[PDB]
RNA sequence: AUGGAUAAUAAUCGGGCAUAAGCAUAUUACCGAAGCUAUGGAUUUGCAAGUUUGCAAGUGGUAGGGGAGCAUUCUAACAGGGUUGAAGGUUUUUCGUAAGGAGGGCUGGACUGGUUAGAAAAGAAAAUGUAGGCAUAAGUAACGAUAAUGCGGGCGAGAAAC
RNA sequence: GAAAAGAACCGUGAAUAACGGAGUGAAAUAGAUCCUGAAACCAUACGCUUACAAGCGGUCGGAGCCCUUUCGUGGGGUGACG
């Protein structure tokens, strides 16, 4: 109707607050999402395709 | 844009530190010592709530036993003869009667005995 | 004259002019309630102890207000695992004022 | 906001009434008498017992010299009294200990059935263990209580 | 609130007689030793104690008390001084801004030395 | 039940202690957990009424997966507050499952912020993390060749060192 | 600090060290370490406890003593003892 009553369709917008590594209580915290030690938990890991 | 949570950063810890009021030493003003003590205090407060319900029943049982042994009886026999008589009075009320109204307690004892 | 009555789920020491805090009752504020669950009476001269739910005995009260108790913080935490959670909890209560203990 | 409305009243120091019980230990076993003495001293035969208050009575054992042990315990009971110095563990006997101040038998028997606290060390000061047959309290009017009526 | 009103209400120092000694190049822990002997004493016993004290922190504390006495005499102009019977109501020794210097320790390192200061405040009060 | 050696700081039925308060069988009452039940309340799926209610099954949790949200900074619209006192700091009351919201007193003396939508330099308790400030050890080590000082006058408020 | 109007002058003090007054200002607890000015840290006054009693210093019960009060199975502080 106006520029102060804009409302998108139900289901088009999402959380947008989900950040990884923001304390225990929001889910992904501590060991952010990579489990414990290993090559797949190091900064800059890339899966070799072949 | 640059966002700094400076005011609420300390307003959040002021509320958690205001409940560490009366703690010995630096457990009341130092932040990283007060936060470690408030959480443990809340952990201790979660329990002891299940224990307050079984530490008062012990006191009630002891007082009922004391009030029943004045009439040449025991707590076990008294509770047996009370439960197998259709009375249904909890130990709280029974101890309150044994402590404050010995006439009512001995009346109950003579009725169930 | 004092009696004991199981009102909601617990027994009390109801007097003639007492104010009691009981659990949340399903009655509007400022209404009359009657409890026919008197387990023991004593009118200062005789204790008419009997089977539960004495026939003629009934305690009448009036509902003053529906309120909530002090907030308690339920805090659970497991050390070295990173698991913790704290929740506030209040208790719904109803205040009643006793206005009569009809015996027999 | 004190939302209980029905509390359990606990006795205070201004409401307790302490008596001056006198107990004859002529025919009695050591532990069999000490258990009842400790229960009376703690205070559990009154329907007003609070666990944190010094309730109860004051016990006066008036025949401690005439107590007896059942088996060969008078000759085979040992008390250890380590002092703190290297090699300072002293061992007494039930026969030697009653040769000097026979009241120590009943005293050490009662001390050990107490809560082992500040309240429990203050309860031991209410116990009077007399070696003879007459006490020295006098103007207190103590009443005799038989331990077989409890 | 109106700041002029708050200041006019807080300007009640026209009765209390006090004295201050700011930026004294002495440590507070060494003057708190001589302040305890003076706290609560009479205005002349305190002077004698400060004059015969075996501490270098009293030579400049014995004249702060004289300045406080003079301020009391200025504020209470109508009246003598020996009939009032002054004493030492409160005396506080606080810290101050300290200077930082360096001392060369052995083996090419440097230690820090803080030359400390202190602030002294005294109020007299009267017996009357 | 009894004899068949025991390890080095003082020892053990947990202790007192018990001749039963030990052991074997049988019986009764009682105590005994966050188990079960009684009362109040909240929430997740499935089924119906609608536009929250009713019933059933649930509701420990690490690695990990999913869903609803709070605060912070800024922007677009509409609607506001403030020198009769804004932001900020300090106490207090109340509300919510929580992150948090709102109100009052004191200091403070100019900005601030509601609703809907959007963006991100968007949240610390630990990295022998960085910078600044301040404690503890403590009035403790030390005051830097064991060639040495004593007295009398002078200036001076003040002299073991001039 | 809007503008130096940046404290003439008097007293203590050896002192143009500091302070107390007096004038400027709306403010001097805006005084040149100068807007508001928190936390760590260092002290003083007041209320309650503490010299026979052993340990993550808290939590659940619990007298006694001090303030407030819509007057209360109301609030705040300290808390002997379990």
mmCIF file with all atom_site columns, N, CA, C and O (backbone and C1' of nucleotides) in Angstrom, chain E residues 59 63, chain F residues 155-162, chain G residues 14-15:
data_model
loop_
_atom_site.group_PDB
_atom_site.id
_atom_site.type_symbol
_atom_site.label_atom_id
_atom_site.label_alt_id
_atom_site.label_comp_id
_atom_site.label_asym_id
_atom_site.label_entity_id
_atom_site.label_seq_id
_atom_site.pdbx_PDB_ins_code
_atom_site.Cartn_x
_atom_site.Cartn_y
_atom_site.Cartn_z
_atom_site.occupancy
_atom_site.B_iso_or_equiv
_atom_site.pdbx_formal_charge
_atom_site.auth_seq_id
_atom_site.auth_comp_id
_atom_site.auth_asym_id
_atom_site.auth_atom_id
_atom_site.pdbx_PDB_model_num
ATOM 1  N N     . UNK E 1 59  ? 56.722 16.747 58.826 1.00 0.00 ? 59  UNK E N     1
ATOM 2  C CA    . UNK E 1 59  ? 57.154 18.138 58.734 1.00 0.00 ? 59  UNK E CA    1
ATOM 3  C C     . UNK E 1 59  ? 56.194 18.970 57.895 1.00 0.00 ? 59  UNK E C     1
ATOM 4  O O     . UNK E 1 59  ? 55.980 20.151 58.188 1.00 0.00 ? 59  UNK E O     1
ATOM 5  N N     . UNK E 1 63  ? 51.961 21.546 59.437 1.00 0.00 ? 63  UNK E N     1
ATOM 6  C CA    . UNK E 1 63  ? 51.518 22.872 59.030 1.00 0.00 ? 63  UNK E CA    1
ATOM 7  C C     . UNK E 1 63  ? 50.206 22.849 58.259 1.00 0.00 ? 63  UNK E C     1
ATOM 8  O O     . UNK E 1 63  ? 49.515 23.874 58.209 1.00 0.00 ? 63  UNK E O     1
ATOM 9  P P     . C   F 2 155 ? 75.114 33.887 59.078 1.00 0.00 ? 155 C   F P     1
ATOM 10 O "O5'" . C   F 2 155 ? 74.459 33.666 57.645 1.00 0.00 ? 155 C   F "O5'" 1
ATOM 11 C "C5'" . C   F 2 155 ? 74.885 34.428 56.526 1.00 0.00 ? 155 C   F "C5'" 1
ATOM 12 C "C4'" . C   F 2 155 ? 74.434 33.800 55.233 1.00 0.00 ? 155 C   F "C4'" 1
ATOM 13 C "C3'" . C   F 2 155 ? 72.981 33.359 55.192 1.00 0.00 ? 155 C   F "C3'" 1
ATOM 14 O "O3'" . C   F 2 155 ? 72.088 34.426 54.930 1.00 0.00 ? 155 C   F "O3'" 1
ATOM 15 C "C1'" . C   F 2 155 ? 74.348 31.623 54.364 1.00 0.00 ? 155 C   F "C1'" 1
ATOM 16 P P     . G   F 2 156 ? 70.857 34.705 55.924 1.00 0.00 ? 156 G   F P     1
ATOM 17 O "O5'" . G   F 2 156 ? 69.917 33.434 55.732 1.00 0.00 ? 156 G   F "O5'" 1
ATOM 18 C "C5'" . G   F 2 156 ? 69.403 33.101 54.452 1.00 0.00 ? 156 G   F "C5'" 1
ATOM 19 C "C4'" . G   F 2 156 ? 69.011 31.647 54.372 1.00 0.00 ? 156 G   F "C4'" 1
ATOM 20 C "C3'" . G   F 2 156 ? 67.972 31.178 55.375 1.00 0.00 ? 156 G   F "C3'" 1
ATOM 21 O "O3'" . G   F 2 156 ? 66.646 31.534 55.025 1.00 0.00 ? 156 G   F "O3'" 1
ATOM 22 C "C1'" . G   F 2 156 ? 69.744 29.631 55.315 1.00 0.00 ? 156 G   F "C1'" 1
ATOM 23 P P     . A   F 2 157 ? 65.641 32.084 56.151 1.00 0.00 ? 157 A   F P     1
ATOM 24 O "O5'" . A   F 2 157 ? 65.604 30.915 57.234 1.00 0.00 ? 157 A   F "O5'" 1
ATOM 25 C "C5'" . A   F 2 157 ? 64.817 31.029 58.412 1.00 0.00 ? 157 A   F "C5'" 1
ATOM 26 C "C4'" . A   F 2 157 ? 63.964 29.804 58.624 1.00 0.00 ? 157 A   F "C4'" 1
ATOM 27 C "C3'" . A   F 2 157 ? 64.702 28.473 58.622 1.00 0.00 ? 157 A   F "C3'" 1
ATOM 28 O "O3'" . A   F 2 157 ? 65.268 28.168 59.885 1.00 0.00 ? 157 A   F "O3'" 1
ATOM 29 C "C1'" . A   F 2 157 ? 62.786 28.329 57.235 1.00 0.00 ? 157 A   F "C1'" 1
ATOM 30 P P     . G   F 2 158 ? 66.782 27.648 59.997 1.00 0.00 ? 158 G   F P     1
ATOM 31 O "O5'" . G   F 2 158 ? 66.713 26.137 59.500 1.00 0.00 ? 158 G   F "O5'" 1
ATOM 32 C "C5'" . G   F 2 158 ? 65.911 25.177 60.172 1.00 0.00 ? 158 G   F "C5'" 1
ATOM 33 C "C4'" . G   F 2 158 ? 65.552 24.030 59.261 1.00 0.00 ? 158 G   F "C4'" 1
ATOM 34 C "C3'" . G   F 2 158 ? 66.727 23.252 58.686 1.00 0.00 ? 158 G   F "C3'" 1
ATOM 35 O "O3'" . G   F 2 158 ? 67.198 22.248 59.570 1.00 0.00 ? 158 G   F "O3'" 1
ATOM 36 C "C1'" . G   F 2 158 ? 65.237 23.829 56.944 1.00 0.00 ? 158 G   F "C1'" 1
ATOM 37 P P     . A   F 2 159 ? 68.692 22.307 60.156 1.00 0.00 ? 159 A   F P     1
ATOM 38 O "O5'" . A   F 2 159 ? 69.395 21.008 59.557 1.00 0.00 ? 159 A   F "O5'" 1
ATOM 39 C "C5'" . A   F 2 159 ? 69.476 20.803 58.151 1.00 0.00 ? 159 A   F "C5'" 1
ATOM 40 C "C4'" . A   F 2 159 ? 70.709 20.022 57.770 1.00 0.00 ? 159 A   F "C4'" 1
ATOM 41 C "C3'" . A   F 2 159 ? 71.752 19.873 58.873 1.00 0.00 ? 159 A   F "C3'" 1
ATOM 42 O "O3'" . A   F 2 159 ? 72.428 18.625 58.723 1.00 0.00 ? 159 A   F "O3'" 1
ATOM 43 C "C1'" . A   F 2 159 ? 72.695 21.050 57.051 1.00 0.00 ? 159 A   F "C1'" 1
ATOM 44 P P     . A   F 2 160 ? 71.791 17.284 59.337 1.00 0.00 ? 160 A   F P     1
ATOM 45 O "O5'" . A   F 2 160 ? 73.012 16.264 59.392 1.00 0.00 ? 160 A   F "O5'" 1
ATOM 46 C "C5'" . A   F 2 160 ? 74.218 16.600 60.062 1.00 0.00 ? 160 A   F "C5'" 1
ATOM 47 C "C4'" . A   F 2 160 ? 75.391 15.843 59.496 1.00 0.00 ? 160 A   F "C4'" 1
ATOM 48 C "C3'" . A   F 2 160 ? 75.656 16.053 58.013 1.00 0.00 ? 160 A   F "C3'" 1
ATOM 49 O "O3'" . A   F 2 160 ? 76.414 17.225 57.764 1.00 0.00 ? 160 A   F "O3'" 1
ATOM 50 C "C1'" . A   F 2 160 ? 75.732 13.736 58.530 1.00 0.00 ? 160 A   F "C1'" 1
ATOM 51 P P     . A   F 2 161 ? 76.016 18.220 56.568 1.00 0.00 ? 161 A   F P     1
ATOM 52 O "O5'" . A   F 2 161 ? 76.544 17.482 55.261 1.00 0.00 ? 161 A   F "O5'" 1
ATOM 53 C "C5'" . A   F 2 161 ? 77.888 17.020 55.176 1.00 0.00 ? 161 A   F "C5'" 1
ATOM 54 C "C4'" . A   F 2 161 ? 78.189 16.411 53.828 1.00 0.00 ? 161 A   F "C4'" 1
ATOM 55 C "C3'" . A   F 2 161 ? 77.904 17.313 52.624 1.00 0.00 ? 161 A   F "C3'" 1
ATOM 56 O "O3'" . A   F 2 161 ? 78.888 17.093 51.614 1.00 0.00 ? 161 A   F "O3'" 1
ATOM 57 C "C1'" . A   F 2 161 ? 76.677 15.309 52.420 1.00 0.00 ? 161 A   F "C1'" 1
ATOM 58 P P     . C   F 2 162 ? 79.830 18.300 51.124 1.00 0.00 ? 162 C   F P     1
ATOM 59 O "O5'" . C   F 2 162 ? 78.819 19.495 50.826 1.00 0.00 ? 162 C   F "O5'" 1
ATOM 60 C "C5'" . C   F 2 162 ? 78.433 19.813 49.496 1.00 0.00 ? 162 C   F "C5'" 1
ATOM 61 C "C4'" . C   F 2 162 ? 78.128 21.283 49.343 1.00 0.00 ? 162 C   F "C4'" 1
ATOM 62 C "C3'" . C   F 2 162 ? 79.210 22.239 49.819 1.00 0.00 ? 162 C   F "C3'" 1
ATOM 63 O "O3'" . C   F 2 162 ? 80.233 22.428 48.856 1.00 0.00 ? 162 C   F "O3'" 1
ATOM 64 C "C1'" . C   F 2 162 ? 77.108 22.940 50.652 1.00 0.00 ? 162 C   F "C1'" 1
ATOM 65 P P     . A   G 3 14  ? 56.646 29.203 57.869 1.00 0.00 ? 14  A   G P     1
ATOM 66 O "O5'" . A   G 3 14  ? 56.846 30.312 56.743 1.00 0.00 ? 14  A   G "O5'" 1
ATOM 67 C "C5'" . A   G 3 14  ? 57.649 31.461 56.975 1.00 0.00 ? 14  A   G "C5'" 1
ATOM 68 C "C4'" . A   G 3 14  ? 58.649 31.669 55.866 1.00 0.00 ? 14  A   G "C4'" 1
ATOM 69 C "C3'" . A   G 3 14  ? 58.077 31.726 54.456 1.00 0.00 ? 14  A   G "C3'" 1
ATOM 70 O "O3'" . A   G 3 14  ? 57.620 33.024 54.115 1.00 0.00 ? 14  A   G "O3'" 1
ATOM 71 C "C1'" . A   G 3 14  ? 59.951 30.272 54.510 1.00 0.00 ? 14  A   G "C1'" 1
ATOM 72 P P     . A   G 3 15  ? 56.130 33.240 53.564 1.00 0.00 ? 15  A   G P     1
ATOM 73 O "O5'" . A   G 3 15  ? 56.183 32.686 52.072 1.00 0.00 ? 15  A   G "O5'" 1
ATOM 74 C "C5'" . A   G 3 15  ? 57.015 33.292 51.093 1.00 0.00 ? 15  A   G "C5'" 1
ATOM 75 C "C4'" . A   G 3 15  ? 57.353 32.325 49.986 1.00 0.00 ? 15  A   G "C4'" 1
ATOM 76 C "C3'" . A   G 3 15  ? 56.170 31.760 49.215 1.00 0.00 ? 15  A   G "C3'" 1
ATOM 77 O "O3'" . A   G 3 15  ? 55.741 32.621 48.176 1.00 0.00 ? 15  A   G "O3'" 1
ATOM 78 C "C1'" . A   G 3 15  ? 57.629 30.001 49.839 1.00 0.00 ? 15  A   G "C1'" 1
#
